[PDB]
Amino acid sequence: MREIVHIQAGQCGNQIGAKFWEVISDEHGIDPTGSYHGDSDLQLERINVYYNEATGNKYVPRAILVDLEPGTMDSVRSGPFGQIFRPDNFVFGQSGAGNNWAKGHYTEGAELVDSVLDVVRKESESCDCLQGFQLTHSLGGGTGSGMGTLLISKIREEYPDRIMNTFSVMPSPKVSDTVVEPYNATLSVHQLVENTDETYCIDNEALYDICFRTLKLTTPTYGDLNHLVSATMSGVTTCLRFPGQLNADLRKLAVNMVPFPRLHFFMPGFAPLLTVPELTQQMFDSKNMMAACDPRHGRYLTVAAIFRGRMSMKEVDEQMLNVQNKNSSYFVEWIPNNVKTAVCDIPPRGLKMSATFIGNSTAIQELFKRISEQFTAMFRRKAFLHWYTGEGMDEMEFTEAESNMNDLVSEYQQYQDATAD
Amino acid sequence: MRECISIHVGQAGVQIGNACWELYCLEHGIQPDGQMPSDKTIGGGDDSFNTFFSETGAGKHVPRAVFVDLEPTVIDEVRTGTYRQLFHPEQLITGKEDAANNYARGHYTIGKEIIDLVLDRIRKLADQCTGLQGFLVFHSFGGGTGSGFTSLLMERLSVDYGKKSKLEFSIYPAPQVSTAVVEPYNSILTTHTTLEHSDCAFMVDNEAIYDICRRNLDIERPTYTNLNRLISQIVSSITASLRFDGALNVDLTEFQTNLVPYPRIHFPLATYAPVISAEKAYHEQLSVAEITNACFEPANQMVKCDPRHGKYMACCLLYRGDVVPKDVNAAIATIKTKRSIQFVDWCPTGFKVGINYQPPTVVPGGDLAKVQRAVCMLSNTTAIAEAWARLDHKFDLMYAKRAFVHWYVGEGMEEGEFSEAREDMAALEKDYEEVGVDSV
Amino acid sequence: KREHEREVIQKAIEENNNFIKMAKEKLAQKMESNKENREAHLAAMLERLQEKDKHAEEVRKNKELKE
Numbered sequence: 001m002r003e004i005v006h007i008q009a010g011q012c013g014n015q016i017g018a019k020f021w022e023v024i025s026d027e028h029g030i031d032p033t034g035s036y037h038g039d040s041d042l043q044l045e046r047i048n049v050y051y052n053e054a055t056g057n058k059y060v061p062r063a064i065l066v067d068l069e070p071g072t073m074d075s076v077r078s079g080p081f082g083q084i085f086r087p088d089n090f091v092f093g094q095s096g097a098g099n100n101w102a103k104g105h106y107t108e109g110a111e112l113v114d115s116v117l118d119v120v121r122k123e124s125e126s127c128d129c130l131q132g133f134q135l136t137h138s139l140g141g142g143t144g145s146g147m148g149t150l151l152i153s154k155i156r157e158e159y160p161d162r163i164m165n166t167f168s169v170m171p172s173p174k175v176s177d178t179v180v181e182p183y184n185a186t187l188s189v190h191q192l193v194e195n196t197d198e199t200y201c202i203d204n205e206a207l208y209d210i211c212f213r214t215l216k217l218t219t220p221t222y223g224d225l226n227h228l229v230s231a232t233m234s235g236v237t238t239c240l241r242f243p244g245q246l247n248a249d250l251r252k253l254a255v256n257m258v259p260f261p262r263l264h265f266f267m268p269g270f271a272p273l274l275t276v277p278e279l280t281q282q283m284f285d286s287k288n289m290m291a292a293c294d295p296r297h298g299r300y301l302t303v304a305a306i307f308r309g310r311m312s313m314k315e316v317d318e319q320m321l322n323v324q325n326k327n328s329s330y331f332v333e334w335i336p337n338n339v340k341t342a343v344c345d346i347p348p349r350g351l352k353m354s355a356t357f358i359g360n361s362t363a364i365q366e367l368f369k370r371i372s373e374q375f376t377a378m379f380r381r382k383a384f385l386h387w388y389t390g391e392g393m394d395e396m397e398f399t400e401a402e403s404n405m406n407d408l409v410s411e412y413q414q415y416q417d418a419t420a421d
Numbered sequence: 422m423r424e425c426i427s428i429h430v431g432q433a434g435v436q437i438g439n440a441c442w443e444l445y446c447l448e449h450g451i452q453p454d455g456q457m458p459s460d461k462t463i464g465g466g467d468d469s470f471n472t473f474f475s476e477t478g479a480g481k482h483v484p485r486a487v488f489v490d491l492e493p494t495v496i497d498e499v500r501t502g503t504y505r506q507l508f509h510p511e512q513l514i515t516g517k518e519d520a521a522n523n524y525a526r527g528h529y530t531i532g533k534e535i536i537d538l539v540l541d542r543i544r545k546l547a548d549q550c551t552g553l554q555g556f557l558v559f560h561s562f563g564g565g566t567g568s569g570f571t572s573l574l575m576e577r578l579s580v581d582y583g584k585k586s587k588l589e590f591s592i593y594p595a596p597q598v599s600t601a602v603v604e605p606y607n608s609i610l611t612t613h614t615t616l617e618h619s620d621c622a623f624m625v626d627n628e629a630i631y632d633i634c635r636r637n638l639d640i641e642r643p644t645y646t647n648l649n650r651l652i653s654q655i656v657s658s659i660t661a662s663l664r665f666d667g668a669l670n671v672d673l674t675e676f677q678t679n680l681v682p683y684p685r686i687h688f689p690l691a692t693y694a695p696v697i698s699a700e701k702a703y704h705e706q707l708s709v710a711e712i713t714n715a716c717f718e719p720a721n722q723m724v725k726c727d728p729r730h731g732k733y734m735a736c737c738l739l740y741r742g743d744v745v746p747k748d749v750n751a752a753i754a755t756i757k758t759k760r761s762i763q764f765v766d767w768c769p770t771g772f773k774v775g776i777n778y779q780p781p782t783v784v785p786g787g788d789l790a791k792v793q794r795a796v797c798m799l800s801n802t803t804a805i806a807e808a809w810a811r812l813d814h815k816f817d818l819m820y821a822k823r824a825f826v827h828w829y830v831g832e833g834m835e836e837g838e839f840s841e842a843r844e845d846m847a848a849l850e851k852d853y854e855e856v857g858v859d860s861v
Numbered sequence: 862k863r864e865h866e867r868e869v870i871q872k873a874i875e876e877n878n879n880f881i882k883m884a885k886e887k888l889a890q891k892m893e894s895n896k897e898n899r900e901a902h903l904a905a906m907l908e909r910l911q912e913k914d915k916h917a918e919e920v921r922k923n924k925e926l927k928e
């Protein structure tokens with residue numbers, strides 16, 4: 001088979017994690033009991049990617065639920081599809097990280113991380129051929145950010161030849177008042193740039209701006225923000241869960257998307273928020289990006305787009321050709337044929353056709369510049385720095401994470417300015 | 422005797438193998454269970470179709486073939502498909518994890534784990550041959566298995582089978598039907614590595630096949646299914662001389678003598694005609710002259726290039742069906758005085774001609790019209806080097822920035838293998854340029 | 862002429878054997894070079910992860926020598 005082991009950490013990680021499993025359980029036609037009641041065998045063809053077959057007639061998410069506070073655990077257990085998760089795969093602390101990255105990475109999380117790895121190892125060894133891991137978490141908090149990146153480092157120690165993808169939620173003042181978040185984000189990025197294959201930059205700033213200005217929702221809830229996230233995560237895993245044009249595991253997908261090891265931060269997009277020309281134009285539009293960046297402020301290294309629904313395959317080919325032609329300047333010339341397309345016959349629930357966009361753009365530097373700005377504005381005053389030195393951290397570790405993300409930005413700028421000649 | 426063993430590597434290789442062996446079975450009257458009613462010598466024989474098929478005591482006719490992939494889902498469809506009874510389980514070999522479009526994984530990391538088993542299974546086919554002629558290797562340039570594992574296999578086959586002939590059917594990458602970006606890397610690497618171990622290689626440009634399916638068969642958006650059925654017809658035309666008999670039949674090895682003037686110059690350009698739909702073939706006979714002339718229309722080539730802007734070193738015509746020499750000769754005479762056909766000065770200009778009397782077959786529910794006569798031209802043209810030039814350029818663009826290289830280095834490769842492979846390709850392009858310069 | 866006949870077929874045997882030999886050697890050298898590189902690459906990766914573990918215990922230790 002081709003297993004993915006799913007891991008969700010912290011509050012944000014667990015609720016977008018629960019949303020992901022709700023949406024794809026619906027698509028694959030299994031109910032909260034874990035029983036299949038669908039209509040197409042295409043729902044079960046690659047059911048093994050995210051589910052274990054269990055007791056007679058029962059499918060159980062290969063998912064591991066982690067948090068330093070027991071609160072969200074009950075929330076998931078109480079939420080829809082709460083009874084589909086394997087009880088033993090619930091691993092929780094009493095502690096509560098309190099938005100302290102150090103507590104997640106070095107102290108509280110470090111004490112809990114072993115029992116997490118125990119559940120990982122149990123799921124992994126039951127795997128016919130594990131293709132990799134995915135982590136849902138935020139970078140602004142303490143558990144999902146600090147312990148999540150600790151978990152990544154530990155997993156890569158036992159599984160150094162497995163693919164590690166993250167869906168990382170980026171902190172924004174428009175959604176969270178918490179002042180210390182640019183510290184937690186910069187510290188986490190410092191880890192993600194070294195130890196992951198793909199990071200989907202789910203930016204709360206972009207999620208907010210979409211709900212507000214496009215979806216016309218005054219004061220949007222987390223449920224509003226996460227509906228976009230679940231729709232996106234459903235899209236980026238469509239080719240893995242349904243048989244189609246792609247015969248591609250996580251490694252092959254990363255190989256054709258990541259030209260440089262550090263530059264693996266993707267800005268995702270969705271459409272709509274309809275004709276194929278309309279779909280295609282929207283998905284390349286800055287308003288439809290899940291990361292607060294303007295693609296026309298940089299260049300695309302690689303692009304992948306998934307169309308879903310019954311539509312003209314010929315028309316998709318032509319519109320993709322059209323877009324690249326009219327926007328030639330925004331794709332790097334020294335990587336030929338860097339824009340790829342797939343089509344799935346099975347549309348998402350509610351939409352008769354949609355499109356999920358995965359962009360590896362140098363314009364993602366804008367997101368890292370935003371964090372760097374907010375980070376540096378705290379670190380000048382050493383504001384709230386004693387929450388980190390208290391756990392045992394040194395100011396140097398802050399300087400290194402700052403400069404490493406600065407290097408990342410300059411590196412994106414390097415390839416943005418590069419020419420064929 | 423004179424058996425040929427076919428080896429199908431990776432997704433492209435395997436699925437093209439399906440198309441070919443299905444077509445072979447229809448051509449020889451072999452049923453999906455392997456039974457062949459018209460074959461009266463049970464359990465064996467020295468017939469022409471025995472070059473590609475062995476026989477069991479139960480009357481089953483078995484392809485002299487091995488299917489190999491580092492991932493199981495493509496070959497699994499063969500194991501459960503219409504022709505699953507045709508193949509013995511040990512002919513179908515799969516690993517669990519593919520090469521992820523990475524040459525290094527195909528040639529080293531993943532490939533080395535299965536290469537011994539593959540050679541063992543091939544050895545078991547060879548041991549049943551009374552006069553093995555050589556191998557036919559089907560693979561893509563762009564896949565990690567098609568590139569990496571194939572070159573590993575070709576290297577090992579040279580060691581285990583000396584100078585025994587090895588022919589390739591290689592799929593040249595086209596963006597229209599590919600979702601990979603690193604294929605120029607894999608292409609240059611396998612070509613460099615395989616060059617010394619291949620006696621003759623037939624490149625099939627996916628874009629050429631894609632265009633032909635769109636323009637000639639009116640297929641809106643061709644699939645692998647559409648391409649492979651067309652490719653199988655070209656492969657059939659080329660191997661037909663090995664699988665059928667006939668007075669006017671000329672063996673592929675005899676054409677090969679003409680096609681390869683120097684060891685490295687072993688890439689013939691294939692052109693096939695007629696490719697026509699049922700709708701258009703109704704009430705429209707395609708004469709020998711008409712299909713022969715279509716061989717010099719560049720739109721019908723298996724590889725995108727312009728022979729009219731290059732030089733010929735060989736020209737072969739492989740006919741099948743209702744065709745007699747008189748008509749061939751007349752058609753050729755016309756073409757020679759109306760076409761842009763120019764040979765290098767060190768090679769004779771005559772066209773070598775072969776005719777198999779058994780007419781082309783079509784797969785049920787296919788797109789191709791059933792015709793009374795077809796022809797495949799095999800020419801050695803300097804223009805084929807254009808395909809190298811396009812590929813090498815895409816390589817250069819990415820390699821200058823070392824794009825995607827870390828994936829290869831991470832699996833054990835060095836940058837020195839890249840530059841060395843690229844330099845071989847530069848020398849190859851120069852070789853094709855040098856053979857076209859007039860003598861002193 | 863007979864001696865020349867023998868020398869021709871002997872040369873043909875010598876060349877075929879030499880081709881087989883050099884192919885076998887060059888391949889064995891390539892697989893060996895690749896095996897070393899890949900191992901060195903993975904070894905370097907693990908060693909980096911091991912400094913981070915060493916760093917993490919110097920962090921937790923620093924926290925106890927804080928009180």
Ligand SMILES: Nc1nc2c(ncn2[C@@H]2O[C@H](COP(=O)(O)OP(=O)(O)OP(=O)(O)O)[C@@H](O)[C@H]2O)c(=O)[nH]1
Nearest residue numbers: 431432433519520521522561563564565566567645
């Ligand atoms: N003509 C044709 N081309 C194919 C077919 N399948 C794949 N290809 C081409 O092959 C290239 C990709 O290589 P694959 O053969 O799919 O990969 P592989 O050999 O299985 O190696 P892996 O990376 O391990 O999967 C692309 O250029 C495809 O267009 C096919 O059935 N017919």
Ligand SMILES: Nc1nc2c(ncn2[C@@H]2O[C@H](COP(=O)(O)OP(=O)(O)O)[C@@H](O)[C@H]2O)c(=O)[nH]1
Nearest residue numbers: 010011012015138140141142143144176222225
């Ligand atoms: N989009 C989204 N963001 C969230 C959600 N929950 C928390 N966040 C964000 O995550 C950050 C806080 O991280 P949190 O999950 O509370 O930290 P932790 O539980 O201690 O690991 C803040 O910037 C929040 O805006 C959610 O359900 N959806």
Ligand SMILES: COC(=O)Nc1nc2ccc(C(=O)c3cccs3)cc2[nH]1
Nearest residue numbers: 134165236239253304305306340341342
């Ligand atoms: C859980 O981690 C991911 O799903 N990684 C991932 N990386 C991907 C890259 C591309 C695609 C995809 O669907 C494509 C569309 C057109 C060509 S590839 C899908 C991908 N999924």
Ligand SMILES: [Ca+2]
Nearest residue numbers: 460462465466
């Ligand atoms: Ca017989």
Ligand SMILES: [Mg+2]
Nearest residue numbers: 431432492519
């Ligand atoms: Mg494959």
